[PDB]
Design a binder for this molecule. Structure first.
Ligand code: 2M2
Length: 265
């Protein structure tokens, strides 16, 4: 694999450590920085294709506070190691669930939403469409900064590691017509807001795929969470507009969340 001196880190500068979920925690060196490293598990060439793709797409997208940023790579004379920012508190779902009462203020929760919307606006400005935006693909740093993940990356019945179905984040036009746009991502954003305000709640509990389809076709919409203002619930519903052109954009969402954060206790 060809050397990219913008990014290449010598192998002897990386101290591999504990597994994270093939993603390990590591130390890049006179000061050490904790980072996350991805590597290939016996794997296909495709798997190597996919890995390199993820890395190159990160090269192009650029730096933002609210996304997992590439930090380097080990490409010469060994397996490929992609090195990125480490977020010590795991995904947004786990972070949220672990701070359920028997803590996060109202303002904290709104602040999370604002940050994810910021990350998404940037990715959008860079022409990137996520296709699986969800609390589980948002990671949280030690400083509680939201960072979007898996933006550089179907069986509708495959469940996640935690027993939930991804189709439940998917806008209708993407689900039935496989048409994906920034506006389908905005739909998924609306679902992710629901997760924030139900402190890591699971959407449509007990609803399998086929019944899911029935609900969407009938125009069903999730109930308002208990820890939710009408304004924030309207924001969700606007995200779930039947007609994609009539959904807000992440630009709009960022501006509205900025104002709300400010006025939230
Ligand atoms: C999303 C996601 C989660 C993981 C690995 N699981 C995990 N568990 C706990 C903490 C944690 N921290 C991480 C993970 C990362 C991104 C790793 C990465 C992604 C793409 C390319 C190279 C490395 N940062 N902090 N991760 O993976 N994804």
């Amino acid at each position: 694999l060809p050397e990219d001196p913008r990014w290449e880190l010598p192998r002897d500068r990386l101290v591999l450590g504990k597994p994270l979920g093939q993603v390990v925690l590591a130390e890049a060196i006179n000061r050490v920085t904790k980072v996350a490293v991805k590597m290939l598990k016996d794997a296909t060439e495709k798997d190597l294709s996919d890995l390199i793709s993820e890395m190159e797409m990160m090269k192009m997208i650029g730096k933002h506070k609210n996304i997992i940023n590439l930090l380097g790579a080990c490409t010469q004379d060994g397996p490929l190691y992609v090195i990125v920012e480490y977020a010590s508190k795991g995904n947004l779902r786990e972070y949220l669930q672990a701070r359920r009462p028997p803590q996060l203020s109202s303002k904290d929760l709104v602040s999370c939403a604002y940050q994810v919307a910021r990350g998404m606006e940037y990715l959008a400005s860079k022409k990137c469409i996520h296709r699986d935006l969800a609390a589980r693909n948002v990671l949280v740093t030690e400083d509680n900064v939201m960072k979007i993940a898996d933006f550089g990356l179907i069986d509708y019945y495959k469940k996640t590691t935690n027993g939930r179905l991804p189709v439940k984040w998917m806008a209708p036009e993407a689900l039935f017509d496989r048409i994906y746009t920034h506006q389908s991502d905005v739909w998924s954003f609306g679902v992710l807001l629901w997760e924030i305000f139900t402190l890591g709640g699971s959407p449509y509990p007990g609803v399998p795929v086929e019944e899911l389809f029935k609900l969407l076709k009938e125009g069903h919409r999730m109930d308002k969470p208990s820890n939710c203002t009408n304004e924030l619930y309207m924001m969700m519903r606007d995200c779930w507009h039947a007609v994609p052109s009539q959904r807000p954009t992440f630009k709009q969402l960022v501006e509205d969340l900025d104002r709300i954060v400010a006025l939230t206790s």
